[PDB]
Amino acid sequence: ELDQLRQEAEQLKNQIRDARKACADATLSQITNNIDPVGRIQMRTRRTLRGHLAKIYAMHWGTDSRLLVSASQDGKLIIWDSYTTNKVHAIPLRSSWVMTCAYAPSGNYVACGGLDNICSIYNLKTREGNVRVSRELAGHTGYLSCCRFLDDNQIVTSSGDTTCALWDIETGQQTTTFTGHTGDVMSLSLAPDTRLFVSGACDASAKLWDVREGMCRQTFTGHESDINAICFFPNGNAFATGSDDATCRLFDLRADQELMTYSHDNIICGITSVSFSKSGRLLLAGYDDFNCNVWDALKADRAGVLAGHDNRVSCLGVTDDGMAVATGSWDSFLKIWN
Amino acid sequence: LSAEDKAAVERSKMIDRNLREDGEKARRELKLLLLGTGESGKSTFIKQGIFETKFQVDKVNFHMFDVGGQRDERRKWIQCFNDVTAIIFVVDSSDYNRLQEALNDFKSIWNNRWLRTISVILFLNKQDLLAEKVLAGKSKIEDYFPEFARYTTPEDATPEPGEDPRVTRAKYFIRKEFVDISTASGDGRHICYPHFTCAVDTENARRIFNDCKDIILQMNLREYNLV
C-alpha cells in the first residue's frame, strides 16, 4: 500500500529532476561573463536613528520613502521621519517579544507580532490623535514570523508552525491557510503584482504560493541549512534567499532552477536579511559578522562592504525609489546608507 | 527651519523623554528564562504563548518567562532570549525513562551558539519520589544506565543527616551526568548550578538569587579586568 505511493513519489521526484537537468542548457555566469562589472560601491552612513534601547529585530519602509517603522525588544514601535530623524509616533506593545513589523502600502496602518502568537494591527490616522489597536489576529499556534500587507484589508502572516495564513482585517478571520512546509517558516516576500508570494522555512526549502487559490506551485531546494530571508526580483520572475550556510542563492520561477550562488571563502556566518536594488543589479545581504555586503546579482562578485554596526545586523530595507538603504542591528541603532 | 518643523522636533524630543523614562524604569529588573518538559513541575517551583511571572527577593525584581504551546524539538526563538541573567532548567527526577531525553535537551541548550555566555541554574524537582523509588526497590536505575554498577558515592561530599546512603548515590549519579555534560565544553564562560528540590520547598527563590549574584560576579570579574 504505502510502498507503491513511496515508489511513485520517488519516480515523480526523479522526473522533475530530469526536467530541471534538461532545461539547464547554459549557465548564467557563462552568459554574463561579458558584462562589465559594477565596480566598487562606496556607501556612506547619512542618518543614524537613535531612541531604541534594546535589540532591533525588524524594519519596514513606507511607500513614500520617508516614513520608517522599526521594532525592538523594549516593546515599542517607532515611526521615523528619515529626512529629519524625527519620531512621528511611539506605539507601546502589550508583548515585549516582537519579531516582525509591517507598514501598510496606504500608510494608514502598521502591524507587529512575535512570541505572543498574535498579529496586532494599529490604526495610525484616528480622530482622537493617538494610535490604537484595530484588532488582534489570533489563530496561529507558533511564534509569529514576518508579516506583509496586501492592501488595507488583507495581510499574509508566517508563524512558528509550518503554515502561512491570509487574513481579512474587517472580520478578523483566516480566509486561506497555506500548508506544505515541514519546518518553521521564517521569511516572506510579496510579488509586485500581489498575486504570488514566496516563503522560506527551516526545512532548507522555499515554496511559491498563489493567494487566490491557496495552492503551492513551485518548490526550490539547494540550501544546506535554515533559510532566514527571501526577496523577490524587481521584475517578479526571480527571487533570492539567504540562509545560515553563509550562502545566498538566486532562484528562477520560469525555469524552476537554481540560477546563481553567492558565497565567499572568508564568510562563515549566517545571513539575516536579503534585499535587492531598484533595478536588481545589486544584491544586499545582512550577515552575522556585523557587516552588510553588496553582491553583483549577475556576475556574483562582491561590490562593496557596509560596516559600522556593533552587533548583529538583523534587518535590511531599500526604498521604493531606491535612493537609500536602511540597516538595523542589535546595538539599538539604525543607519541609513546612500 | 519652519514652524511646523520646530513643533515636530519638539514632539520628537517629548517622545525621547518618554522613551528614556520607560527604558530607565525597565532597566532595573533581572530576566530569567524557564525551560523543562511537561513532567518537570516548572509551573510550581516559585511560590510567589508567553507566561509571565514576577517575584522579589531582597528588594530585587526578577522577571521569569515561560514559553508554552510550542514544540520542544527545535527552539530557534532562543536568539531573542539572549543576554538574559540566567536560564532555569527543571529536570523531572525519578523518571528513568526520560532522563536520557532530559540530558539530551540540556546538552542541546548548553551547546547553543546564542547561549555561550549564559549560565544555567539546574533544578532536580521532587526528589521525594526518587527517595521512595530507590527505597522500595523494583525499579532499577542500573537497567537504564550501565554506569550505575561501578559508581561509588564520593567520600568528600556529605548527605543530609537523616538521608539514607542509597538515596545519595542515585542523587549524585544523576547530578554527575549533568555536571559532566556541563564541564565537557563551554571554555569557562558559563557554568551550571545543580540544585536538589521538591514540590514543598520554599527556598528556591533564595537559591536563584544567590546563583544570580554568583553569575553577575563572574561576569564582572571578566568585564572589569581582573581575571
Epitope: E128, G129 | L1, A3, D5, A8, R11, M14
Partner: single-chain antibody, 231 residues
C-alpha cells in the same frame, strides 16, 4: 471630539476676566492649542498659542503683556487670562486644536466660542468679498500673499477655512493640496508661492458661508479678509 468654552460676559474697561475651554473625546496632552478672535463684524484674528508640553508659548503683538495662556493636562482644560481689557477686545473667542507632526492637519477642530463684550508680518489679501452663486456652478476664490509661502523643504503653508452662518470655522484644505478629513471631493486647491486659488465644483446649499485664507509659515499667523458666497 467636543470643545466647550465658557467664561464670557460684559466687562467694564480695565477689568480682568479668565476664559476656560473644556476638552473631551481626544488625547488633550498630545495636542497644541490656539486662541482665535472673530470680531463682531470683521474677520478672524490670532491671539495666542501653547504647545503640547507648554514648552513654547506665542502671543500676538496686540495682546502681548496683557493676555496670558495656560494649560492644565490632568484636568483637560485650557485657560486664557485677560488683563487691561480695551474696547477692541469685544469679540468671540475660539479654541482651536493642533498636533503638528509630519503629514498631519493642524487646525482641524474648532470650539463653539464665547462672546466677550467690553464697554514685518505677512499680509494675506483676498481682493474679492462677495460673489453671487447659483447651485450646480463652479467658482474660484483667489488669495495673494506679501511673501512667498513655498518653503525650501518643498511644502507651502496655506490653509482654507469655511465658516457657515452661525457656526464655527471648519478646515477645508491644508498645504494648498491636501483635503481635510470629512471634506467632500468637490473642493480643490492649487497655486504657486504667492498666488493661490480654491476651486469649488458642483456648488451646493451647504457652501454659503465665508471662506478664509490662512498662512502658517511663521508667527504670528495671519488670516484673510474673507470671501462670502451668496445664493
Amino acid at each position: 471630539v467636543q470643545l466647550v468654552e465658557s467664561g464670557g460676559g460684559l466687562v467694564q474697561p480695565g477689568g480682568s476676566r479668565k476664559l476656560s475651554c473644556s476638552a473631551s473625546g481626544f488625547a488633550f496632552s498630545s495636542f497644541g492649542m490656539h486662541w482665535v478672535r472673530q470680531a463682531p463684524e470683521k474677520g478672524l484674528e490670532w491671539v495666542a498659542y501653547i504647545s503640547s508640553g507648554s514648552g513654547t508659548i506665542y502671543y500676538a503683538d496686540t495682546v502681548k503683556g496683557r493676555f496670558t495662556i495656560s494649560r492644565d493636562d490632568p484636568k483637560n482644560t485650557l485657560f486664557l487670562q485677560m488683563t487691561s481689557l480695551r474696547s477692541e477686545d469685544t469679540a468671540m473667542y475660539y479654541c482651536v486644536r493642533s498636533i503638528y507632526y509630519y503629514g498631519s492637519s493642524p487646525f482641524d477642530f474648532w470650539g463653539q466660542g464665547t462672546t466677550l463684550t467690553v464697554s514685518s508680518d505677512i499680509v494675506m489679501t483676498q481682493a474679492t468679498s462677495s460673489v453671487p452663486v447659483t447651485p450646480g456652478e463652479s467658482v474660484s476664490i483667489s488669495c495673494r500673499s506679501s511673501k512667498s509661502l513655498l518653503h525650501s523643504n518643498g511644502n507651502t503653508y496655506l490653509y482654507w477655512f469655511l465658516q457657515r452662518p452661525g457656526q464655527s470655522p471648519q478646515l477645508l484644505i491644508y498645504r494648498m493640496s491636501n483635503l481635510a478629513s470629512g471634506v467632500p471631493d468637490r473642493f480643490s486647491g492649487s497655486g504657486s508661492g504667492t498666488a493661490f486659488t480654491l476651486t469649488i465644483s458642483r456648488l451646493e446649499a451647504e457652501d454659503v458661508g465665508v471662506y478664509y485664507c490662512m498662512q502658517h509659515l511663521e508667527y504670528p499667523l495671519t488670516f484673510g479678509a474673507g470671501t462670502k458666497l451668496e445664493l
